[PDB]
Write an enzyme that holds these catalytic residues in place. Sequence first.
Site, mmCIF file in Angstrom:
data_model
loop_
_atom_site.group_PDB
_atom_site.id
_atom_site.type_symbol
_atom_site.label_atom_id
_atom_site.label_comp_id
_atom_site.label_asym_id
_atom_site.label_seq_id
_atom_site.Cartn_x
_atom_site.Cartn_y
_atom_site.Cartn_z
ATOM 1 N N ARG A 76 134.960 -32.355 -8.223
ATOM 2 C CA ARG A 76 133.928 -33.035 -7.446
ATOM 3 C C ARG A 76 132.575 -32.388 -7.589
ATOM 4 O O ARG A 76 132.457 -31.171 -7.697
ATOM 5 C CB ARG A 76 134.328 -33.060 -5.965
ATOM 6 C CG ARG A 76 133.475 -33.997 -5.125
ATOM 7 C CD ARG A 76 134.004 -34.142 -3.719
ATOM 8 N NE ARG A 76 133.726 -32.961 -2.919
ATOM 9 C CZ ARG A 76 133.863 -32.943 -1.620
ATOM 10 N NH1 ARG A 76 134.427 -33.932 -0.961
ATOM 11 N NH2 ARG A 76 133.447 -31.859 -0.944
ATOM 12 N N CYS A 109 128.761 -33.143 -5.456
ATOM 13 C CA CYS A 109 128.109 -33.886 -4.373
ATOM 14 C C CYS A 109 126.649 -33.467 -4.259
ATOM 15 O O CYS A 109 126.257 -32.344 -4.511
ATOM 16 C CB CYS A 109 128.743 -33.532 -3.003
ATOM 17 S SG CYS A 109 130.489 -33.744 -2.887
#
Lengths: 126, 126, 126
Positions: free
Chosen positions: A104, A106
């Site tokens: 991930r 972000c």
Amino acid sequence: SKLTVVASPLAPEAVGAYSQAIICNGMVYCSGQIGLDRKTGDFAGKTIEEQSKQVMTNLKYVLEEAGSSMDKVVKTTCLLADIKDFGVFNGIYAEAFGNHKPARACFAAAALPKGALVEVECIATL
Amino acid sequence: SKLTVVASPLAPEAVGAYSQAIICNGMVYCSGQIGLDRKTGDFAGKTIEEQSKQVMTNLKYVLEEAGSSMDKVVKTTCLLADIKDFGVFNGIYAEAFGNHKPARACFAAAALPKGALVEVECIATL
Amino acid sequence: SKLTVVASPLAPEAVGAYSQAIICNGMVYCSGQIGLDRKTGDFAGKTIEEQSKQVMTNLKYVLEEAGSSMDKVVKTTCLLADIKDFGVFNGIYAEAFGNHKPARACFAAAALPKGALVEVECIATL
Ligand SMILES: [Cl-]
Ligand SMILES: [Cl-]
Ligand SMILES: [Cl-]
């Protein structure tokens, strides 16, 4: 290395210059979902909670249509309109994936298309 | 198309909804590293220089754990809290990769998780 | 899993810590193009229209050099300096790809390198 267009009738319609996802060489490349409800063509709601849930639901629809799944997601990128929404978003994201833990990245964007509060793209395997 | 979770004890711990990296189909998809020191769970320092060095060190740890290397990186994405930090960041990035030259995209985010000044994700080969 | 550096003489020169694109395992990972004209080393113009056209032309040059094509693009990421430029950008993007419809994610960055108004990266197949 054929490309296959993914078009779920459940996810927001792709009627412009993009596809919901493209399958290529055993992988599914998913567009950045925003929290539109295909039934209305409008945001599921005005809040981060409402849009985040819709975004993760939309991703699942696209992945399923492609022959993939949430558990087959290898990497996501999670874009927020506002960094303060990170905690709430993250909880909703985590619920959506259960015990599966993609790679991930972000960040908060200056702004997202259509005034969305959250956008999530991913790559998955078949 | 098995997914393998990468968890280096040297890189920041992944204890939430993500993995440091995922291996799939011969490729390593690395999360966006921020400049946390695993020993402290805190930023390596307050400055761009300190955090940038830590980020590149962290990436190397993750890549090594995966069976990859810095020289096997095909593409990075480099996120800054502040565009004026581009030059300094770029020097530190370049030192880290030596003569290896991944494909790259860079931008300033409105904000990054945890108030980080820099975040770098990548994709690599085995 | 050899990496091959892509260096078109038509696209902006890569003389720093990155390559225009990297080929690996049948895929082409393209750097985020900004709207520089290789002939001048300067932006093609000050406007969104001018830079957007240049960016898409640059991408095509890189893809061709790699042995790929615009029609082989699986996914793009489209970064804007200003969200209000989305509509204009999108038209120019769409012209560039014709009927081909990659997966896509778009957002406004706080800022882009060199003061660019638009940056577009992609992944393609051979
Ligand atoms: Cl992603
Ligand atoms: Cl990347
Ligand atoms: Cl991309």
